[PDB]
Design a protein around this ligand. Structure first.
Ligand SMILES: CCCCCCCCCCCCCCCCCC(=O)OC[C@H](CO[C@@H]1O[C@H](CO[C@H]2O[C@H](CO)[C@H](O)[C@H](O)[C@H]2O)[C@H](O)[C@H](O)[C@H]1O)OC(=O)CCCCCCCCCCCCCCCCC
Ligand code: CLA
Ligand code: CLA
Ligand code: CLA
Ligand code: CLA
Ligand code: CLA
Ligand code: CLA
Ligand SMILES: CCCCCCCCCCCCCCCCCC(=O)OC[C@H](CO[C@@H]1O[C@H](CO)[C@H](O)[C@H](O)[C@H]1O)OC(=O)CCCCCCCCCCCCCCCCC
Ligand SMILES: CC1=CCCC(C)(C)[C@H]1/C=C/C(C)=C/C=C/C(C)=C/C=C/C=C(C)/C=C/C=C(C)/C=C/C1=C(C)CCCC1(C)C
Ligand SMILES: CC1=CCCC(C)(C)[C@H]1/C=C/C(C)=C/C=C/C(C)=C/C=C/C=C(C)/C=C/C=C(C)/C=C/C1=C(C)CCCC1(C)C
Ligand SMILES: CC1=CCCC(C)(C)[C@H]1/C=C/C(C)=C/C=C/C(C)=C/C=C/C=C(C)/C=C/C=C(C)/C=C/C1=C(C)CCCC1(C)C
Lengths: 93, 45, 504, 37, 34, 131, 451, 90
């Protein structure tokens, strides 16, 4: 769409929004790729962060990484234009 | 698929038309002399 | 028989019918001038000279009428925006009707000279053949042109007996026809000094008058007569075409680059005023001077005239049009209604941002916002790409100072994107689109169209000059060569090439 | 790599492929020597 | 500068490039049917 | 420049020009087909840009980390090994071009990888945009 | 000296080989010397590629085109396309070099000091171009020689060590071909197959059994036809049809070998059976499908549902549907869905790629092959820079398939041009107006005006 | 889902100068909206295999067509074909 206010969190800022961003934005955070982020993208829709921490099948070390990356991580309303492109998104460089 | 032929009715014209053209050409050739020559080409028609 | 491309060579040795066809061409040109003026008066809108001047409406001969005095109309209006109670005869309509009558008179004269071709004046008293004493004719015409140039520059331009020429200020705000005193120093060769016009015409008229006296008085040398083929009129044609395309190149340059003879209130601004930020620098200087007097931004930007902000706009750039985007400039972006004011773009932290202006090369330019340092702080994505510095993310807000939207602050993203896309083009204006059904692609000014037409005409007349010089210097071998060429083309047969007396 | 018994003859093997081009140039030189009769 | 592999390259190239012209020159010296 | 970090503590080593040239040649011969320009043609989510190497577990912004990756490559998280998929001296039988690289060769390759961000900056790992 | 100038032959120095048309012995010398040149290039380039061979890199990464030709035939090749010994390549090169010395001596002898015309000294070898019987005898002898060569290939493939079959289970190995396809239906349905996409005419031979069986057929046909031409003279229709002169025969050969050049270029570009990708490298279709297949594997293994991933246009991003209804790889590689490769056919069901076999039946060597082929795609430049034309000068790779295909397409077109030139001149010289129009009797002046 | 996946009138720079209202006539075409329409599927099983988990029959589908990302009216599509599936262990 022409107008979309919830797109500084698709990799343009520090805070990363789930269920609307590609797997490439988890490469900025060490230890969040290609593991962990796979669990985030597979079970995409979340209400907030705690829903991701509970519904995701995260092991204790993965939970330690999640505890390492609380503040640069959020969960907003899902947009189907970005849900369908959370694995490839057409970016390759 | 030989010669792109999938139906056997397609073979009837492909074989038949050259036969008729060969019949006309064979009349023409039977009108000819048809003995060997020693030249680059045959000037007899 | 004659080919189709040689049908006019029948008047080459017929002076009476040569004068007749010249009269017919002159009548056609004068009639075109009159009819073009009448059509432009039919399609001209004199209501708003500030935001809809004559160059926005595609007027072509109206600028040339307004350049040297004719500014009023019988309808009661002037191109300066004033009201004229008593227009007088020499209005736009008066000039057009005078040109139509002149065309008719020249047409009748052409008829007479075509019928009465065998005048005794055109026959040589010595030989009896139809001949023209071209050097003395050139002397007479040079004397006449010197008299006309001196009179124009001494009475018309100076206002001694005449209206003067169009003189504007440095930024095209207050321009009118004024008497012009000549400048005889080196400052008369400043092309943006209108005093140079008067001084040039006076001095060149005097020199041309003296040279015409000389050319009437003195016969040409035999070496120059044989070398330049002065008995043949095609050398006159060749040299005249050469001088004409020289003059066409000169006028093309002075139109494109601008001079005092091509003011921006008649032909529009130049592309180099947009490239250098001429009007932008002037507007910023005025705003800074008003801010130094204790005014706030609203009062400083409200003091900027609408004409000055209208000049600082890329739609008025002559280098933004198209070859086949025909029509007036109002057929493009539209008819300008109002100046919306200067947009100032602020992010969520209050830092000011300026949209980078579109260069004249680019049909489309990406919308990017830079800070005072020059770093990209916000932009608009291309069409649908994932973004990092978008307008919605940075939260860019735009506040307008001056103009119609003075004091208003827009914070919603679609409006901010719209106004940033407008500010990419320069000053933000309001355009009317339903009057002429404007498509939305920029069109060139009369300055640009004049430059295009006359550059191409000069380039083609260079070829014409080459052709006629060739036909002049090679008249004896026009239909081909003979058997006297075979001996000359032998290598080393003669010492000097082409000379039979230098045989080895 | 060549076998070590013949590895010292590598430069000749490197020169060898372009020799037919030298044969073409040799034909041209031979025609130059007879004056292109 | 001086490499035995490069030296042998240049020697072999010189012999190859001068064998044929040597044939032509020697045939021209013996006044053969060149 | 010729000075790249060596250890994870902050130790730096000054590379000889012969090492730089040999590392450039070996990187263009053994890694170029998949790491032209500092990017990855087969996994474009990761690259040889210093930000991607530094923000990794373990961080590959030093000589020893790069040599260890060339000896035992792991995933970006580090828990899973990719020695079957990525060339390594452990998998030199899998990838035949690795069988000629020694420890000094890996040292030169790592020095070239660390040395390129300081040569024509923003073009190493920036893809076709910075060409 | 008469016969070697323009005053005695009518041909200039730049057309001096046409002075050999009626000089049979010197023509034989020229042909034998040229054969020596060809064998010399074979030996010299074979030894050059042996000397430049790096045991670590594959054959297609080193710019070698003759070592792959020997690797097809099973010399020094282990299982999986591994080059284990290059000594037989050296043997081939040295044998060709010595044979080229012999052939060059023969060519020089017959060109310079042998008899100019063989028709009086050795009548069994002398000939006239207009004598159809002797020319057909020579043609039959050469046909039987070619049949013997084809049977040499057959003997190599069936008895002497075998040839490299890239379709052998496990990843390809040198295999004795014991049951060649002698069925004329298959062999001549290859010949009558369409040359367009999905069929490929005879470029689409996908197993060594068909190759060996049809080479048996070619040898039998060539030998039978050679004896046929040794014992017969052309029929009356053939005598009326063709021009009987040396230049006409040359033009016929030129068009035949031009067609062969085109066909070999397409063999090198598309076929991966007679041109295995372990040696010549992957084809363009093979490289694109390798890239798509490796991405498919990396997304099926690392958590991405490839069969339900909608692309940017609503089509398949990884797996899509073919125009004939099969499951093929999605993306821009959908045009290359006709690819058959030994590393993908075990993973291919009756409806295309079987998803269950993709997720279950992958052998690791197929992973290695697909990971190797996806990087060295046949895209290069004349200055040998790898990748697309918008790449930097750091990759040095142009595929041998590209070199062979471009060179032989160039030569096929050039020899079609030569065929047209020589056929036109043969007709004009037979009719007798190859030197220009006769001024005394111009054919056009004796015709009625056309309008 | 929409037929296509994921802000200017690039053609007309003079259209975005009108003042206050620029390129707003060509806004719905510019605003490519990802629209997820809904549909209903009804399938019946004509024959069911007992040895395996296979079933066969016909299906009737009703859904919407391309929206041009929210630029054209979605026409409803009626699809009546055949269906097959296997039921086994999860
Ligand atoms: C007309 C004038 C032509 C002569 C050109 C000048 C000669 C010297 C320059 C030259 O050639 O260049 C020098 C090269 C030698 O240079 C080396 O050439 C190598 C060639 O690479 C090859 O090897 C590399 C690895 O070694 C890669 O594998 C790469 O893919 C493969 O192509 C690399 O570029 C090396 O970096 C470079 O040092 O000579 C060559 O290769 C020799 C090639 C000459 C034989 C070419 C025969 C024609 C081939 C068929 C052409 C098809 C034509 C179609 C129309 C086009
Ligand atoms: C050097 C030649 C030249 C040049 C540069 C222009 C330049 C221009 N003409 Mg023009 N015109 C010319 C010759 C020329 N005209 C001639 C010879 C005719 C008669 C056929 C016209 C008839 C004409 C019309 C009818 C119109 C123009 C218009 C225009 C403008 C677009 C522009 C100012 C248009 C415009 O904006 O004028 C209002 C327009 O409508 N011209
Ligand atoms: C002052 C300008 C001028 C004048 C008076 C002449 C005069 C002449 N030219 Mg000439 N010419 C000129 C400019 C000029 N030319 C230029 C600029 C070029 C370069 C393009 C040429 C190229 C040229 C050639 C190549 C030839 C001439 C020839 C001739 C002679 C025959 C007349 C003719 O061609 O009509 C014949 C009738 C026509 C051409 C009518 C056809 C209509 C034309 C093609 C298009 C319509 C044009 C429009 C209106 C013009 C607009 C105006 C602003 C230019 C005549 C003496 C011929 C000559 O010397 O023969 C002995 C000849 O062969 N000229
Ligand atoms: C494949 C290349 C090739 C071959 C095999 C031939 C062969 C021949 N050409 Mg020829 N030619 C060629 C290319 C070739 N040409 C090209 C490219 C041109 C254009 C420049 C010509 C132009 C040309 C003309 C104008 C004429 C010939 C003629 C001849 C014939 C007589 C040769 C002669 O008397 O030379 C004598 C040459 C020499 C004595 C010097 C060369 C000595 C040898 C051959 C050099 C090579 C030796 C070798 C390196 C050592 C091998 C020995 C072995 C033991 C290892 C001969 C059959 C003539 C002909 O038609 O005769 C009737 C003739 O008039 N040619
Ligand atoms: C088996 C192949 C073969 C054979 C035996 C011949 C034999 C002959 N040709 Mg021939 N030809 C061939 C292939 C062949 N050609 C091909 C493929 C072409 C198309 C390019 C031609 C084009 C051709 C022409 C145009 C002519 C001959 C001529 C001749 C006769 C004299 C040749 C001579 O003295 O050369 C002397 C050799 C040279 C001077 C060396 C020249 C080296 C060239 C310039 C290298 C550059 C080639 C260039 C890159 C190719 C262009 C691109 C291509 C696509 C066209 C002789 C009967 C001539 C003749 O009189 O016929 C009776 C003649 O005029 N041929
Ligand atoms: C297809 C290739 C070919 C063909 C058709 C011929 C044909 C011929 N060669 Mg010949 N030759 C060839 C290749 C060829 N040669 C090669 C490659 C060499 C180098 C070893 C020679 C070396 C050679 C010599 C040295 C002599 C011939 C001679 C002859 C002629 C006598 C017949 C003969 O050899 O008796 C058959 C003999 C044994 C089976 C005959 C025209 C003889 C000749 O012309 O005498 C004047 C002769 O003295 N040839
Ligand atoms: C290089 C391969 C080659 C070449 C150039 C020729 C050339 C020729 N063949 Mg031939 N032929 C060949 C291989 C070849 N043959 C083989 C391998 C066979 C066995 C299948 C035959 C079986 C064959 C028959 C049965 C006949 C020819 C005939 C002919 C002549 C006319 C062909 C035509 O117009 O079409 C011509 C001289 C015709 C002819 O004139 O008979 C002598 C004819 O009737 N050919
Ligand atoms: C020999 C050339 C000189 C011949 C003299 C006659 C000139 C003939 C002019 C050619 C016109 C014939 C056009 C038919 C070609 C065509 O596309 O057929 C099209 C048919 C295929 O036809 C398609 O086949 C499909 C197969 O699934 C389907 O059946 C389609 O329905 C059917 O249309 O192809 C053939 O018949 C090929 C026959 C074998 C030809 C292979 C040689 C071609 C490669 C060498 C030529 C390039 C060099
Ligand atoms: C399309 C085209 C071709 C390529 C070049 C270019 C792109 C520039 C473009 C230019 C085309 C050209 C050359 C157009 C020419 C237009 C012209 C010459 C128009 C002129 C028309 C003349 C007119 C009305 C004259 C009217 C005069 C009248 C009643 C006089 C009447 C009278 C007479 C006859 C006797 C006395 C009394 C009175 C009343 C005065
Ligand atoms: C045994 C050994 C172990 C490992 C090392 C090593 C590789 C060196 C190897 C050594 C191999 C050796 C010594 C091979 C010997 C090779 C030889 C002598 C090759 C030469 C063959 C000669 C040839 C074709 C010549 C043919 C003649 C031609 C065209 C003449 C054509 C022409 C003539 C007839 C008229 C004029 C125009 C022209 C074009 C010149
Ligand atoms: C099956 C397969 C897999 C891989 C390897 C293997 C060799 C086995 C391969 C092929 C095996 C076989 C049996 C291949 C057979 C190929 C054949 C029969 C090729 C023959 C092509 C015939 C051609 C051009 C004919 C050309 C003649 C033409 C136009 C006409 C000539 C003339 C006539 C007769 C009519 C008028 C015009 C003219 C010029 C006077």
């Amino acid at each position: 769409n022409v107008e979309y206010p919830n797109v500084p969190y698709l990799g343009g800022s520090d805070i990363i929004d789930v269920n609307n961003a590609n797997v490439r934005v988890y490469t900025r955070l060490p230890g969040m790729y290609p593991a962990i982020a796979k669990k985030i993208i597979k079970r995409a829709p979340y209400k907030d962060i705690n829903e991701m921490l509970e519904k995701g099948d995260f092991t204790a070390a993965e939970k330690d990484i999640l505890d390492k990356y609380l503040p640069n991580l959020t969960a907003l309303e899902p947009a189907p234009e970005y849900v369908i492109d959370n694995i490839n998104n057409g970016l390759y460089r | 698929e030989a010669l792109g032929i999938d139906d056997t009715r397609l073979i009837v014209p492909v074989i038949l038309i050259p036969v008729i053209t060969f019949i006309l050409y064979a009349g023409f050739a039977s009108e000819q002399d048809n003995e060997d020559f020693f030249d680059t080409y045959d000037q007899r028609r | 028989g004659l080919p189709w491309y040689r049908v006019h060579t029948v008047v080459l040795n017929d002076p009476g019918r040569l004068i007749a066809v010249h009269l017919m061409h002159t009548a056609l040109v004068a009639g075109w001038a009159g009819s073009m003026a009448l059509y432009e008066l039919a399609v001209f809108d004199p209501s708003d000279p500030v935001l809809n001047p004559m160059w926005r409406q595609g007027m072509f001969v109206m600028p040339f009428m307004a350049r040297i005095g004719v500014t009023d109309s019988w309808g009661g209006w002037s191109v300066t925006g004033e009201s004229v109670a008593n227009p007088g005869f020499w209005s736009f309509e008066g000039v057009a009707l005078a040109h139509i009558g002149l065309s008719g008179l020249l047409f009748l004269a052409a008829v007479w000279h075509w019928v009465y071709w065998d005048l005794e004046l055109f026959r040589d008293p010595r030989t009896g053949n139809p001949a023209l004493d071209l050097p003395k004719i050139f002397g007479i015409h040079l004397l006449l042109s010197g008299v006309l140039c001196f009179g124009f520059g001494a009475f018309h331009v100076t206002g001694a007996w005449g209206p003067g020429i169009w003189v504007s200020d440095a930024y095209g705000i207050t321009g009118k026809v004024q008497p012009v005193a000549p400048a005889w120093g080196a400052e008369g060769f400043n092309p943006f000094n209108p005093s140079g016009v008067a001084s040039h015409h006076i001095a060149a008229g005097i020199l041309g008058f003296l040279a015409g006296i000389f050319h009437i008085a003195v016969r040409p040398p035999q070496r120059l007569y044989r070398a330049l083929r002065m008995g043949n009129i095609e050398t006159v044609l060749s040299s005249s075409i050469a001088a004409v395309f020289w003059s066409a190149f000169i006028t093309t340059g002075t139109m494109w680059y601008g001079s005092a003879t091509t003011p921006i209130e008649l032909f529009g601004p130049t592309r180099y005023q947009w490239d250098s930020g001429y009007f932008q620098q002037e507007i910023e200087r005025r705003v800074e001077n008003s801010l130094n007097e204790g005014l706030n931004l609203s009062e400083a930007w409200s003091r900027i005239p609408d004409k000055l902000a209208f000049y600082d706009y890329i739609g008025n750039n002559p280098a933004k049009g198209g070859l086949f985007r025909a029509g007036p400039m109002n057929k493009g972006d539209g008819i300008a209604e109002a100046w919306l004011g200067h947009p100032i773009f602020q992010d969520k932290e209050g830092k000011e941002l300026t949209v980078r202006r579109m260069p004249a090369f680019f049909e489309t330019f990406p919308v990017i916002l830079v800070d005072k340092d020059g770093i990209i702080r916000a932009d608009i994505p291309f069409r649908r790409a994932e973004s990092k510095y978008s307008i919605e993310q940075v939260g860019v807000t735009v506040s307008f100072y001056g103009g119609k939207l003075n004091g208003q602050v827009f914070k919603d993203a679609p409006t901010v994107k719209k106004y940033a896309r407008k500010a990419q083009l320069g000053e933000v204006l309001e355009f009317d689109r339903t009057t002429l059904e404007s498509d939305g692609v920029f069109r060139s000014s009369p300055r640009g169209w004049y430059t295009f037409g006359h550059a191409n005409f000069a380039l083609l007349f260079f070829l014409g000059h080459l052709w006629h010089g060739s036909r002049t210097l090679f008249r004896d071998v026009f239909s081909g060569i003979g058997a006297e060429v075979t001996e000359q083309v032998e290598f080393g047969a003669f010492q000097k090439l082409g000379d039979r007396s230098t045989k080895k | 790599k060549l076998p070590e018994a013949y590895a010292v003859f590598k430069p000749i093997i490197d020169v060898a492929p372009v020799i037919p081009v030298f044969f073409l140039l040799l034909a041209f030189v031979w025609q130059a020597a007879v004056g292109f009769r | 500068m001086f490499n035995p592999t490069t030296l042998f390259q240049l020697i072999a190239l010189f012999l190859v490039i001068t064998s044929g012209p040597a044939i032509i020159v020697l045939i021209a010296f013996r006044r053969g049917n060149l | 420049t010729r000075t790249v970090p060596l250890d994870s503590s902050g130790t730096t080593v000054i590379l000889t020009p012969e090492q730089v040239k040999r590392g450039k040649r070996l990187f263009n011969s053994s890694c170029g087909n998949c790491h032209v320009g500092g990017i990855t043609k087969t996994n474009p989510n990761l690259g040889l840009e210093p930000d991607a190497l530094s923000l990794a577990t373990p961080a590959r912004d030093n000589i020893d980390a790069l040599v260890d990756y060339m000896k035992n490559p792991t995933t970006y998280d580090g828990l899973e090994s990719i020695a079957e998929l990525h060339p390594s001296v452990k998998s030199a039988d899998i990838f035949p071009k690795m069988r000629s690289l020694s420890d000094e060769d890996l040292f030169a390759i790592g020095g070239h990888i660390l040395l390129q961000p300081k040569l024509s900056s923003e073009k190493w790992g920036g893809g076709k945009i910075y060409y | 000296v008469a016969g070697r100038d323009i005053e005695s032959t009518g041909f200039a120095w730049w057309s001096g080989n046409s002075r050999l048309i009626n000089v049979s012995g010197k023509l034989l010398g020229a042909h034998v010397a040229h054969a020596g040149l060809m064998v010399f290039w074979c030996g010299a380039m074979t030894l050059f590629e042996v000397a430049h061979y790096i045991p670590e890199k594959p054959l297609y990464e080193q710019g070698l085109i003759l070592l792959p030709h020997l690797a097809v035939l099973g010399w020094g090749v282990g299982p999986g396309g591994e080059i284990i010994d290059i000594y037989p390549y050296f043997v081939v090169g040295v044998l060709h070099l010595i044979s080229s010395a012999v052939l060059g001596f023969g060519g020089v002898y017959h060109s310079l000091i042998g008899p100019d015309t063989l028709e009086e000294s050795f009548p069994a070898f002398g000939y006239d171009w207009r004598d159809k019987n002797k020319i057909t005898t020579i043609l039959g002898i050469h046909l039987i020689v070619l049949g013997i060569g084809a049977f040499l290939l057959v003997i190599k493939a069936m008895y002497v060590g075998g040839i490299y079959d890239t379709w052998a289970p496990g990843g390809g190995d040198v295999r004795i071909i014991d049951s060649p396809t002698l069925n004329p239906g298959v062999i001549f349905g290859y010949v009558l197959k369409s040359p367009w996409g999905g069929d490929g005419w005879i470029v689409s031979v996908n197993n060594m059994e068909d190759l060996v069986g049809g080479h048996i057929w070619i040898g039998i046909i060539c030998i039978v036809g050679g004896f046929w031409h040794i014992f017969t003279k052309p029929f009356a229709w053939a005598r009326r049809a063709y021009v009987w002169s040396g230049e006409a025969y040359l033009s016929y050969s030129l068009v035949a070998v031009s067609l062969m050049g085109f066909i070999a270029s397409q063999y090198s570009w598309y076929n991966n059976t007679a041109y295995p990708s372990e040696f010549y490298g992957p084809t363009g279709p093979e490289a694109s499908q390798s890239q798509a297949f490796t991405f498919l594997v990396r997304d099926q293994r690392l958590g991405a549902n490839v069969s339900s991933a909608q692309g940017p246009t609503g089509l398949g991003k990884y797996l899509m549907r073919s125009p004939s209804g099969e499951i093929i790889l999605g993306g821009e590689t959908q045009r290359f869905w006709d690819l058959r490769a030994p590393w993908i056919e075990p993973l291919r069901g009756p409806n295309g790629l079987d998803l269950n076999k993709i997720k279950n039946d992958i052998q690791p060597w197929q992973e290695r092959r697909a990971a190797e082929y996806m990087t060295h795609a046949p895209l290069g430049s004349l200055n040998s820079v790898g990748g697309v034309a918008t790449e930097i000068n750091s990759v040095n790779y142009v595929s041998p398939r590209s070199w062979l295909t471009c060179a032989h397409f160039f030569l096929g077109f050039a020899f079609y041009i030569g065929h047209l030139w020589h056929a036109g001149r043969a007709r004009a010289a037979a009719a007798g107006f190859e030197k220009g129009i006769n001024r005394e009797n111009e054919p056009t002046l004796s015709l009625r005006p056309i309008d | 889902p929409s037929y296509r996946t994921g802000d200017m009138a690039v053609a007309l720079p003079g259209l975005e100068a009108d003042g206050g209202e620029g390129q707003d006539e060509l806004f719905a075409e510019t605003n490519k909206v990802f629209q997820v329409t809904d549909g209903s599927i009804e399938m019946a099983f004509n024959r069911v295999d007992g040895t395996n988990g296979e079933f066969s029959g016909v299906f009737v589908s009703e859904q919407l067509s391309d929206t041009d990302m929210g630029s054209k009216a979605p026409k409803k599509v009626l699809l009546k074909g055949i269906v097959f599936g296997k039921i086994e262990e999860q």
